[PDB]
Design an enzyme around this catalytic site. Structure first.
Site, PDB file in Angstrom:
ATOM      1  N   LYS E 154     -39.965  -6.587  21.988  1.00  0.00           N
ATOM      2  CA  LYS E 154     -39.238  -5.408  22.384  1.00  0.00           C
ATOM      3  C   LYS E 154     -40.046  -4.132  22.237  1.00  0.00           C
ATOM      4  CE  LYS E 154     -35.322  -2.544  21.586  1.00  0.00           C
ATOM      5  NZ  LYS E 154     -34.110  -2.301  20.770  1.00  0.00           N
ATOM      6  N   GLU E 180     -29.946   4.909  15.006  1.00  0.00           N
ATOM      7  CA  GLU E 180     -31.179   4.227  14.622  1.00  0.00           C
ATOM      8  C   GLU E 180     -31.221   3.996  13.108  1.00  0.00           C
ATOM      9  OE1 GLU E 180     -35.464   4.337  15.541  1.00  0.00           O
ATOM     10  OE2 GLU E 180     -34.343   2.853  16.681  1.00  0.00           O
ATOM     11  N   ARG E 181     -31.792   2.881  12.674  1.00  0.00           N
ATOM     12  CA  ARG E 181     -31.884   2.693  11.202  1.00  0.00           C
ATOM     13  C   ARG E 181     -33.070   3.519  10.723  1.00  0.00           C
ATOM     14  NH1 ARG E 181     -30.772  -2.161  14.115  1.00  0.00           N
ATOM     15  NH2 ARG E 181     -29.080  -3.342  13.212  1.00  0.00           N
TER      16      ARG E 181
END
Lengths: 48, 487, 25, 467, 466, 414, 138
Positions: E154, E180-181
């Protein structure tokens, strides 16, 4: 051996089809339970 | 004075509705006449909906409420070790006051994006299945999820126990302080829990924050943050800390209870629209810092209880979506004899090998692969009236490798012991052995090398991998032990 | 139509399909 | 203080006090009634009006009716003179035998034992029931839970435990009937008497009884457990004795609360439950416990609405137990009683370090095979059994026999099974299963293993069946 | 205008104005706070009071606190000096490289390209990726559903597309991380950096990063995809490029929507989502197109809940997608990379009436062969590879050559593969596969085609492989 | 509401008013519709049988006086029939001398249709059962509150008999439509809806009512009230919330399945899922003697009958199990309107349970029972009157019976 | 379209219908294509939940069948005494996973005078138009 092959081809293909259907039945049910359980909460809350 | 103090208009179901308190800030701690504290969660036009921290029997209409001006903070640092504290940091083990110097605020923002660095240091559990196939690194957030009674808390405990190998050691960059948060549990369970930890001499490096079944909702709510702060003191100071949230399911319930009683709008499962934000702001405070910041870390093992294995229900969906991987436990597995019940196919570690040791990788890697391969064929076994020896081979590797992942509780292993045993089946040595015996083999085999061969394990350990030499030495050690074994 | 039962059925049919495809080959 | 009734809607009554507002939990008595009506204060609505839950019928109450604050939560007669007696939610004898002359009185509301008061001794409590003992052993002083949907065996199981354990127990017993069947309290009372556990002539009574059955208003049902539990806490603390607590059925406490919840003005949580279910359950369950002062061995029946174990109530109760016996209508339906589910029942003492490896390896051995068979069930269903490996058609065998060897004729269900009740000793159990698992009876027929006590009866029954 | 705070309930602040009420969508600034607190307006409760949603913690607010109507929606620094920087929801720097100093500011809430600005035609946007360009062609201004997650490349694929957009179209790209983390953003940051797409030293950065971290309140993770959108619209409406928009992941956008909705007390609809699920999506998706000035193309990471493709979140989303890029772990295991699945990935523009018969036929040729081989796969392993016909043995050979010819070296992974990246052209792509189908390289060996660019390289590799 | 013997043979509405246009009721007593059920002290264990006339029921899920047994199943599975046959079977004792064996019946229609009730009271009249039945009708067009009250009304009329040392039987047909009525009345009062839209107290709605069916001790007249409430399931789902709410109040349930019904098994009683919490204490010794273990035998039979829907190398003990299972299943079958006398049931079950029919062909069994019963009723009423009278099966009766069955059976299979 | 307020998406079909009605009303013949009634239904439901009307099956408001019957009743064939004109409606409905039993699809089937069901299977297998000749009707 040609009849067992044929019979097991069908059986396997029926299975998969059954699999595809139960899965789709599962998601419809999964969505309706949530929706159903949530409308029930809202109804109770609104009545107050 | 309606600016710094208020009067209770009505009190019920633990929600106080105060008139006045015009100067309170959101989430501020206030105090009722009786001495009970409360936190202001709803600042409304005509009133303050206060969340009572205790029995609302001690509050009546008209009671006077005063501001504290202070926001919720808790004790912190090294003196809490080996202590049992409530959600506010108060000692509940009746061993005397915690000598805490520093006090930290329970809800703080997670370290941003710049202050961190890739999770790279192994966080070892001592559980072979986890350590070889679902590796946890320091700063990682890995969820333990499963139905009731599947082995979830056991994983955490074995993990805590395991850190003594490094906590008794000299290398201070390998020590990991542990924090266990108990939310909604009954007091006998925690008491039993602390006992098991004392008996293993793990309380010395553990802190226990406990918000149990009879503690008011808000304390059960807070518990995980107040425990987080405690673990942050280590993270920030170049030290490493491990935190177990048991469970996030019960805290979600605590929060839902206050939300609905304050009348905020209910969404699916009656959970408030900000339940996702309650956990994300909690689980993000775990992270691996950069040397520029001390290189310290905070690893978190949050527990989620699923229902009938519905990993897609609401709360299980949030937390899965927030964390770096999941250890999925299953009843069917459990009762079939696989303990710990880890479902290896669905468990995951986004961090992966970035956290495995070279020793482990040296073995973990082919094991992961024959297993995935077995999993493809497994179902055939029981009707395999005539399978080719190609796949018949993978069924055999399959069942032996599986038996090697089994494990009793309270006995976490040293990474060197795990690779020695894994090597045994992975290399093919137990392929001719009986499935029914692998458990007995390992046990005795490992007893033997932990006795007689502590120099090879010390090598493996040190060299960090399996040298061509030690490789050959193990070959003989197992081929002679096996011979011994089937006599 | 219970998510439990549905799941119980899927479980046993996925195996059938597997054992049945094997027997065919 | 004296308040007036301002509104009546079912079990909920609002009262307006002019001076002096009774604190929450306080009990108020309605003036002008042939019978004693207690109202527990539930909330302070403001405007010197309190919302309360009635401890009995609200018929005939009138707006404006007088109400006196009793100045304290419901307090009941506690002490040894409660033994052999039958009490109310509010502590009144209901056995027609006169007042209960106790030295003291206790308020049914109280804080749960502190963390430093907990105990961690873990002793197996043998019951004589094959299944429980083998797979989910009860523990002395532990918390036990019998889970089951309507009509699967919760009560009968509680009935045989009273017989196999309560009867020899040297200590008191408190049986609190919460929202269950009136017929049943009459069956038990008269049974206690016919067996001398209750003595109407002397002070040899070893069991106190408290009842708030299904014919009561929500309010009574939301409190009897408290009354029951309060009686039990006395013998635990003030006497320091070994108590046996039976509650049937604790779900009723939670259903009671959900029934007035809306009238208390609350947004419903999921499944209709009240938003305070867990905490309401927590402050209660936390008192039902063994401490360093005394020991409680609580056996609680837990109803499972719609048979769904995930229902917020049954679901929320698992955490309060040390051992759980889960009953299933799917098992019962086959005629296997007790209908315990061998793969959904657990005990905190199922530890090799506590029961021993022989006990432990057998149990787990029995569970693996039943699991192994569960998985095959759906498949031999369709694809039949021929293709199965002799290795696998032997586990189908042994499993089906174990499935039976786990049933047992209870001594309290002869009216049901038409079989004399058998009590099997822990070693007769471990051994019987050990042998079935060992292949030592692959010759006897399954039926020989159905409704029998010890393994020898299965062997004898084989012959009798031999023709 | 200066309002006061009348109420604070979680992330929903009510503000009362004495003279002059801010319209809906305006951004208000809270006065007297260590950091910037932007309250977006959401409703006009009447009586001079507005109901807003905080873009960050309301911890500490005080009834009566002062609020200043910024007299406009959230506006952000837009333009070139954003490229390579990391930015907040309200256009603030979160990479600590000082102020984002641009000339223009762009309000995030913008309407979409009037009908008369619409382009009337379908054009493939080339990325230079053999699978993508041959079997699941992206569309200019279209939206692509990127499936598959970790282990499957990805992030390297997202980074090659970036590069290849800069290269072949002189277009820049934006990256909006919705929910988003924090761990994963910082890791995305340094990974782009090491591969160059970002340059801290010069002015050659080809990406601007916009982040909406998971700790941010509903409203923030709600809007950050719009902010990212704003940025991209500039490189199109101001510089008429072909920008690339990456929303990771499109599901957290929708979820943020529901959280906000629930907070505003609106009744959820089917499955608990927002009543406005379809409009919340449409008002955003529609701003992504090819106008006469240029075009924004969006690669959207999709998360499918409960593996339910008919779940309202996913179902709604496909209404807008023109193609899917399915990353596959299975393919990866063949060593094949990019690990895109040639039979599962799809595209709306794979119509002869759009890609032209040649393109369309080759593509349909590649897939069938790949399909047929799939069939045989079962046979080969069991009954052994030989009842195989002069014919059945050719479909396999070619298929296996094809499978490989579909793999390719990325310039993004040069710092690592010690190999040179290839950006094959569309023409080269169709020819390549055309000939293999044709039978022109049946003599060539499999490994001649593994990890190469244009067929010419398949030929030369063969030479070096004797 | 009006209460007492005057109501027998009359059709009243939910308040007591007559609706058979047969004149005013001559009532002298009244009773509150809502009275709490007698407590612990005033009752005595259920011990006297309440014979339905239905083998399946009287043998497998026995009903005693003071007992509450639920009839539950989907639409049209035969729930009302069980109740009618029961009311009709009571003539036996009512036409008799003994006043302790008599049973006055009450039939409460709720939400039902007037023409159906009219059909119902006709049949009762044609069976000469109205004389001892009261019919409280609260039908489809009656206001929600009438439908709601109807059960309590009818209950109160039954307590008159219960509190006066007499015996009453009340059928609540059905408690499903009442719940709906309650739900409606309740929502229209603006009381917040709860689970499934019903009031949070629907359990309570039915517990309060059914606790009233009870057995009083001799100190209170020894009278009793027996209730047979009906509940309608959907898609045979008995786990459903309402269904289980009510199953958790009564002293057992009779579950009727449409599958069994279509299959020929009528009554469609599902052996496995039905229960009687009174057990054999509500059975005569004659019956206990013959059907003491039959219930768990048939349960265990249904299982293996499934486990061999593939004759899996089956032994003998199970071949014997399947051979009894099928024969016994045929005997429990029964038609409508022909309630059998207890000794008649004992005679026929006897034949099966003893193995005398293990060699007859299943298909024959029904025909045999009509032949056999004919024989003993006509010729042998001395054995019937003794079994009936002694109430047990003595050693000689048991010997006279073995003799009759085996010989008649032989001549029968000529 | 996708970006216009729900009220406009809701309205759109009624407006187009009135335009088709001019032709119907004047001895002329028009054809109206509602693409899709699926999305109009969700637009109307957004309106209904925002107005707070009780959500029912699939959260749709109680009157969504009427949202559609009123609309489609207007397609019609007048007789000579009224012009002989006509309006033909080809409304489009999008099913999920070929589920033609859903609330909305069923509603609409119970209004029109036949259906043309296109199948995904058919479509890939190369039969296009993917019409399902047994299921479809006129």
């Amino acid at each position: 051996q040609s009849a067992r092959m044929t019979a097991m081809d069908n059986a396997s293909k029926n299975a998969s089809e059954m699999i595809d259907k139960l899965t789709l039945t599962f998601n419809r049910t999964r969505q309706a339970v949530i929706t159903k359980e949530l409308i029930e909460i809202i109804s109770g809350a609104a009545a107050l | 004075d309606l600016e710094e103090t208020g009067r209770v208009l009505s009190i019920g179901d633990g929600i106080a509705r105060v008139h006045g308190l015009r100067n309170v800030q959101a989430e501020e701690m206030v105090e009722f006449s009786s001495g009970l504290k409360g936190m202001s969660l709803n600042l409304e036009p005509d009133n303050v909906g206060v969340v009572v921290f205790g029995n609302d029997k001690l509050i009546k209409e008209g009671d006077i409420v005063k501001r504290t001006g202070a926001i919720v903070d808790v004790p912190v640092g090294e003196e809490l070790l080996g202590r049992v504290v409530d959600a506010l940091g108060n000692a509940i083990d009746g061993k005397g006051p915690i000598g805490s110097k520093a006090r930290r605020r329970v809800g703080l923002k997670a370290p941003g994006i710049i202050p961190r660095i890739s999770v790279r240091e192994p966080m070892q559990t001592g559980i072979k299945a986890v350590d070889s196939l679902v590796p946890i690194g320091r700063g990682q957030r890995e969820l333990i999820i499963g139905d009731r009674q599947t082995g979830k808390t056991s994983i955490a405990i074995d993990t805590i126990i395991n850190q003594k190998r490094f906590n008794d050691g000299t290398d201070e960059k390998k020590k990991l302080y542990c924090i266990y948060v108990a939310i909604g549990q009954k007091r006998s369970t925690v008491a039993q829990l602390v006992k098991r930890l004392t008996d293993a001499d793990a309380m010395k490096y553990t802190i226990v924050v406990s918000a149990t079944a009879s503690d008011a909702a808000p304390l059960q709510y807070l518990a995980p943050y107040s425990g987080c702060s405690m673990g942050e003191y280590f993270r920030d100071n170049g030290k490493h800390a491990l935190i177990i949230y048991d469970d996030l399911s019960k805290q979600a319930v605590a929060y839902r209870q206050m939300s609905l009683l304050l009348r905020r709008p209910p969404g699916r499962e009656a959970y408030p629209g900000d339940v996702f934000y309650l956990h994300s702001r909690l689980l993000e405070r775990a992270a691996k810092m950069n040397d520029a910041f001390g290189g310290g870390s905070l690893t978190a093992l949050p527990v989620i209880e699923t229902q009938a294995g519905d990993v897609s229900a609401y709360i299980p969906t949030n937390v899965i979506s927030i964390t770096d991987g999941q250890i999925f436990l299953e009843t069917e597995l459990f009762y079939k004899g696989i303990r710990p019940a880890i479902n290896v196919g669905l468990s995951v570690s986004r961090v992966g090998s970035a956290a495995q040791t070279r020793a482990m990788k040296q073995v973990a890697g082919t094991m992961k692969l024959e297993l995935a391969q077995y999993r493809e064929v497994a179902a055939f076994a029981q009707f395999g009236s005539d399978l080719d020896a190609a796949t018949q081979q993978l069924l055999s590797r399959g069942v032996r490798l599986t038996e090697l992942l089994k494990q009793g509780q309270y006995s976490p292993m040293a990474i060197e012991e795990q690779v020695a045993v894994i090597y045994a089946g992975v290399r093919g040595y137990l392929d001719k052995l009986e499935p029914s015996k692998i458990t007995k083999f390992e046990n005795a085999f490992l007893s033997h090398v932990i006795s007689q061969h502590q120099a090879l394990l010390s090598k493996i350990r040190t060299d960090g991998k399996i040298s061509e030499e030690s490789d050959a030495k193990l070959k003989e050690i197992v081929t002679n032990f096996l011979a011994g074994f089937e006599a | 139509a219970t998510l439990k039962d549905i799941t119980r059925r899927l479980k046993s049919i996925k195996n059938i399909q597997k054992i049945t495809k094997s027997m065919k080959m | 203080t004296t308040g007036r009734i301002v509104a009546v809607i079912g079990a909920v009554v609002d009262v307006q006090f002019d001076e002096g507002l009774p604190p929450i939990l306080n009990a108020l008595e309605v003036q002008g009634r042939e019978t004693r009506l207690v109202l527990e204060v539930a909330q302070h609505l403001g405007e010197s009006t309190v919302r309360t839950i009635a401890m009995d019928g609200t018929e005939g109450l009138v707006r404006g009716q007088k109400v006196l604050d009793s100045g304290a939560p419901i307090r009941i007669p506690v002490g040894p003179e409660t033994l052999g007696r039958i009490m109310n939610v509010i502590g009144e004898p209901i056995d027609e035998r006169g007042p209960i002359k106790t030295k003291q009185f206790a308020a049914i509301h109280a804080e749960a034992p502190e963390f430093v008061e907990m105990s961690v001794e873990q002793e197996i409590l043998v019951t004589g029931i094959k299944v429980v003992d083998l797979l989910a052993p009860y523990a002395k002083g532990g918390k036990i839970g019998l889970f089951g949907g309507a009509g699967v065996g919760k009560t009968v199981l509680i009935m045989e435990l009273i017989n196999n354990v309560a009867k020899a127990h040297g200590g008191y017993s408190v049986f609190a009937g919460v929202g269950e069947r009136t017929r049943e309290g009459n069956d038990l009372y008269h049974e206690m008497i016919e067996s001398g556990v209750i003595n109407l002539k002397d002070a040899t009574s070893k069991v106190a009884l408290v009842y708030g059955q299904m014919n009561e208003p929500p309010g009574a049902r939301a409190r009897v457990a408290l009354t029951g539990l309060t009686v039990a806490e006395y013998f635990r603390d003030q006497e320091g004795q070994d108590v046996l607590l039976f509650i049937d059925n604790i779900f009723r406490f939670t259903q009671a609360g959900s029934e007035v919840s809306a009238l208390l003005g609350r947004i419903p949580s999921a499944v209709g439950y009240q938003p305070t279910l867990a905490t309401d359950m927590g402050t209660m369950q936390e008192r039902i416990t063994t401490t360093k002062k005394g020991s409680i061995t609580s056996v609680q029946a837990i109803y499972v609405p719609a048979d769904d174990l995930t229902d917020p109530a049954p679901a929320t109760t698992f955490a309060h137990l040390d051992a759980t016996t889960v009953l299933s209508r799917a098992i019962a339906e086959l005629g296997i009683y007790p209908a315990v589910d061998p793969l959904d029942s657990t005990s905190r003492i199922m530890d090799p370090n506590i029961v021993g490896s022989e006990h432990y390896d057998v149990a787990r051995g029995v569970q693996k095979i039943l699991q192994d068979y569960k998985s095959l069930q759906d498949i031999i269903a369709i694809l039949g059994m021929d293709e199965l490996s002799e290795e696998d058609k032997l586990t189908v065998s042994r499993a089906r026999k174990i499935q039976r060897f786990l049933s047992q004729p209870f001594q309290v269900a002869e009216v049901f099974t038409g079989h004399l009740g058998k009590l099997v000793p822990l070693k007769e159990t471990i051994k019987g299963f050990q042998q079935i698992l060992a292949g030592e009876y692959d010759h006897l027929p399954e039926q020989a293993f159905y409704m029998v006590g010890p393994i020898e009866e299965a062997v004898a029954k084989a012959d009798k069946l031999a023709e």
